[PDB]
Design a binder for this molecule. Structure first.
Ligand SMILES: O=C(O)c1cn(C2CC2)c2cc(N3C=CN([C@@H]4O[C@H](C(=O)O)[C@@H](O)[C@H](O)[C@H]4O)CC3)c(F)cc2c1=O
Ligand SMILES: O=C(O)c1cn(C2CC2)c2cc(N3C=CN([C@@H]4O[C@H](C(=O)O)[C@@H](O)[C@H](O)[C@H]4O)CC3)c(F)cc2c1=O
Lengths: 598, 596
């Protein structure tokens, strides 16, 4: 369980972000136990941030292995009366946390939070907090790294100077303490550890079913307040499970959010949770939000800004939401990893719909004998399923109460058209459906493949989410051919009668390149590419959404097809609109959020 | 007045209140209707810390005139009330009124320096609302100065504006809001440290730290000095308020080779740790001496300016900017044209970057017929009183920084006109009185036809010149620029005191090129700098070069501003122009010490 740390009448919240000490591992940092003493001959590194782009050093940017972060932690002794917790919102990719040279916890997985109590007996007058951070990726990590020194994106072979991470995905491997580190407290004896809300609409009355997980013995009380502060439901001494009702409930709607304040108390412990009331259901070829047929308009994003890389950037989060409202979007996907809680909470407050995605990109070993992706671990297949289950558990545990989250994406462009794929994914879908109290739709995001009718998403998903590049990776500069090949395939998907959508489609576009005559990489070609795709999708009644690749240009590994990163953004990396951004502002201004295809 | 940087200690809580706050533009009725007494209704959400102007896509927000209201909930543990509870605002631009529940706690004027207020415990209810009203208006009484007609500082045909707008008397965009973090911190109620003053004495081959510890209440004082590894190298218990400690084996703080001791102070239960670099600064003859060695400034005037936060604290960019300056071979910058965040100052102490620390005094000029320094009752500028408070507050905040080597009293005031000396004499006197280290003081000189009457000559320890030979004069005639540059700078050189460029540059749009001198091109920017250097490299009293600017930055709109000021060596997103590589090469051949 992972409630978002907040300041309450019972909970201290102390942010440890700022300038920390930082040192690259030279192969001896664990042997010489650097975590037992002040880091020596070190740099300084801002926290939170990815550390790859902060300096000017290729050796820093392309480091392979561990680094050590460290700061002093001199906390008031008064807090020893409370329970003291160190919360790491995200550390990419794996972490070992030491206080005063004692290992307190380890974590695997770069994009979900973890915490540990500091034992009171470990706290001195002055303390050292050391975080060791591993950036290595392989066939057992999510995201998947290649183990063969080849590039996912050479014409003549060469021996690399140093060993480097080789991503099996198309985005730069930004690592470090990506999101805030905070110290918080709760009472020692009795405290709230999790909160689970679900809702049901009976005419204009909402029934909110709650389960409040707690530690210790005390009495649980829950209260529901309007934005303006009026109590509208209250029940006392309810224990763990229970329900309550709101008369004339204001529903949470895309672009028209409404959040109630849910105040929980358990003994001395107090926690407030914002909560929007809304329903999600797939019915026929319809994606129903509040029982109305939704049409997705938006993007796959990345958490990517300069110079922090993947690091939390709160002004840019507000800027990006403001740009999506300017453009007329209503939704995005968290490609390809869970985003910060601060973004998710802002989406709840601003009314932006989210497809929440796990970290499972690169689950594909065929993107001295040939190997199948989903062969036995013994026979060389991918080793990600056990961690994949943990990521699903933790993602839903973190984000289950968000009104903005309407669909879970189990993986991006895994090898779903090969043998064994169904056997790998069926337990993960079953896991997602078992653990989400709201029972939201589940999808996997489908790689473009020649044997698309063989994609196991057909057996598993509530919505078929397709990544397709008709006019870019195929039919490049032949948009007539693109239109015919797009129609041939999408008519197949449309004939299945279930809702389907684009979760990626686009064309690399360098701002400032132009031509009136179709030419790839120009601003005009981006627009023509999209016009050609919309000629097809606009005629298909099961096509219920368009999310472009990408919201904005972002950093990737180096390669002959990556023009200083991925250039498929509608916006540049500094959020400036290309021609196609204005095209979509016009297009989305004429398409309603509901009832476009009714 | 005393403004210790808030830190987490054994006796002090530190609660950061940054995040998403509610935000509402005032419509003229915000105070009349007492908006601060309830939740803001029909409000937006705004990140804190940040400037608010560029977060949305609204021109009316960006160009808003007057007040806005920020607000958040503040539900804190009651056991905090056993401590002294303090609300610290690191910066609110330009003026603030702070309310807790219905109650006005404080009001502040000056948009770039911290202020704080105790929260009386009788006011803290179970649930609390914190409201901050922020005024963005500028006039002849604010620093920085706003114009009080419809004039733009940057028009061919006259027109009536749709709405009233601030008219800056300065070349940067009027970014406003809760610029820097808002934090809640605590100290012991009954005995606590209010200020710490440290100075260094290097005479007789013996390095000593002199301390003076300001307290409230009655208790015993102790001070210890610790190396970076944590070895105690001097300590004394039950000490007086003032005293000295000898540091054997002292390592000096040097430009690009920082060393910071940790100075831990105890007073009763209170504990405060202050990083401290030991170094000397002095002007002797025509030399700027750091640790008794002749320094040559290499660097920039900067701005706090990033997209989309505007003036807002951006700590990843701070670290990126220092990395770029070390990559380029710079050793210094000036806080143009306002105090920067404490986070930047502290990072500069850590990284060995030398800082010229400047007040908010830009626009002190009414004639870019009433003269600037006429009597206030005849229309003269009305800033002198606030100018003293800013100097007091700036020195109180930054006095212990080793990186700060020089105070800049104003940028481009009307210092060649009648009355300037009398306006500035008390301010120089004040800065010298208040700085325990007695660092050099200057004002940054506007380019001016009667430069021999610049009152900087009568006041300043270092003459700091803003000159644009080859841009605002002699544009595209660099041979004439060289001659005009040499004529004036030989005058300055003949005075025998240290002098330097604090600004020089040429607007340069990345991607515009020409092998033949053409303004706005990347090549012209290089040639502009080559021409100036042809002259400055021959003048033995010229002890420093700070370009205008480190990076492109936002300004008001006008016919000569190409989406802001384009004189950066880097772009707004920190990419090097041709001239940035030119300077990396040049500054790699110029030593920090002993160039001239
Ligand atoms: O996708 C990859 O990996 C490779 C791709 N291409 C493509 C043709 C670009 C390679 C080409 C190779 N030839 C290399 C040099 N030729 C000269 O070079 C100029 C240029 O290419 O700039 C042309 O303009 C000149 O006309 C021509 O004389 C071109 C072709 C090659 F050896 C390897 C690759 C790859 O490995
Ligand atoms: O349209 C024109 O003809 C002129 C226009 N302007 C104004 C800026 C519109 C002039 C301004 C002059 N001063 C104004 C600012 N001083 C420093 O210059 C930087 C910069 O301007 O780049 C600013 O950013 C720094 O903050 C500031 O310290 C330089 C001297 C001048 F001498 C001549 C002109 C013109 O001639």
């Amino acid at each position: 369980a992972m409630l978002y740390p907040i300041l309450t009448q019972s909970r201290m919240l102390i942010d440890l972000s700022g300038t920390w000490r930082f040192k690259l591992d030279d192969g001896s940092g664990f042997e010489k136990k650097w975590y037992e003493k002040t880091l020596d001959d070190a740099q300084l590194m801002p926290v939170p941030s990815s550390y790859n782009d902060i300096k000017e050093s290729a050796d820093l940017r392309d480091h392979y292995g561990w680094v050590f972060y460290q700061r002093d932690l001199n906390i008031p002794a008064y807090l020893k009366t409370q329970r003291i917790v160190l919360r790491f919102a995200a550390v990419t990719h794996s972490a070992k946390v030491y206080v005063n040279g004692t290992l307190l916890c380890e974590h695997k997985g770069g994009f979900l939070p973890f915490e540990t109590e500091i034992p009171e007996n470990l706290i001195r007058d002055e303390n050292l907090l050391t975080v060791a951070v591993d950036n290595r990726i392989d066939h057992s990590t999510l995201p998947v790294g290649r183990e063969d020194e080849s590039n996912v994106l050479s014409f003549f072979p060469y021996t690399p100077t140093k060993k480097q991470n080789k991503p099996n995905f198309d985005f730069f491997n930004y690592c470090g303490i990506t999101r805030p580190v905070k110290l918080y407290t709760t009472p020692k004896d009795a405290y709230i550890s999790d909160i689970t809300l679900t809702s049901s609409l009976e005419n204009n009355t909402a029934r909110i079913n709650y389960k409040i997980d707690t530690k210790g013995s005390a009495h649980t009380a829950i209260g529901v307040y309007t934005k303006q502060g009026v109590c509208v439901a209250q029940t006392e001494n309810t224990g763990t499970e229970g329900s309550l009702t709101i008369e004339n409930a204001v529903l949470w709607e895309p672009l028209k959010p409404y959040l109630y304040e849910v105040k929980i108390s358990f003994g001395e412990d107090r926690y407030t949770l914002p909560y929007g009331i809304r329903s999600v259901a797939v019915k026929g070829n319809k994606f129903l939000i509040n029982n109305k047929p939704f049409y997705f308009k938006g993007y796959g994003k990345h958490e990517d800004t300069f110079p922090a890389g993947r690091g939390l950037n709160m002004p840019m989060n507000a800027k990006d939401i403001s740009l999506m409202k300017w453009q007329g979007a209503n939704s995005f996907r968290t490609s390809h990893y869970p985003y910060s809680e601060e973004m998710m909470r802002l989406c709840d407050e601003e009314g932006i719909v989210v497809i929440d995605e796990t970290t499972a990109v690169g689950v594909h070993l065929n993107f001295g004998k040939r190997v199948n992706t989903f062969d036995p671990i013994e026979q060389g297949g991918i080793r990600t399923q056990s961690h994949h289950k943990e990521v699903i558990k933790d993602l839903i545990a973190r984000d289950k109460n968000h009104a903005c989250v309407v669909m879970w994406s189990i993986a991006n462009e895994a090898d779903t058209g090969s043998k064994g794929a169904y056997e790998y994914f069926k337990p993960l879908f079953d896991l997602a459906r078992e653990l989400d109290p709201q029972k939201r739709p589940c999808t996997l995001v489908s790689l473009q493949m020649v044997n698309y009718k063989e994609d196991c998403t057909i057996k598993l998903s509530d919505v078929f989410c397709l990544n397709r590049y008709y006019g870019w990776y195929t039919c490049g500069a032949d948009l007539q051919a693109a239109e015919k090949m797009c129609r041939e395939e999408l008519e197949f998907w449309n004939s299945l009668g279930k809702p389907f959508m684009y979760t990626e489609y686009g064309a690399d576009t360098v701002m400032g390149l132009h031509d009136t005559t179709d030419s790839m990489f120009t601003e005009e070609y981006q627009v023509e590419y999209y016009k050609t795709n919309h000629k097809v999708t606009d005629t298909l009644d099961c096509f219920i959404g368009e999310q472009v690749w990408n919201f904005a240009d972002f950093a990737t590994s180096q390669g002959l097809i990556r023009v200083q990163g991925n250039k498929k953004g509608l916006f540049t990396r500094d959020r400036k609109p290309k021609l196609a951004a204005h095209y979509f502002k016009e297009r989305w201004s004429k398409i309603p959020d509901f009832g476009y295809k009714k």
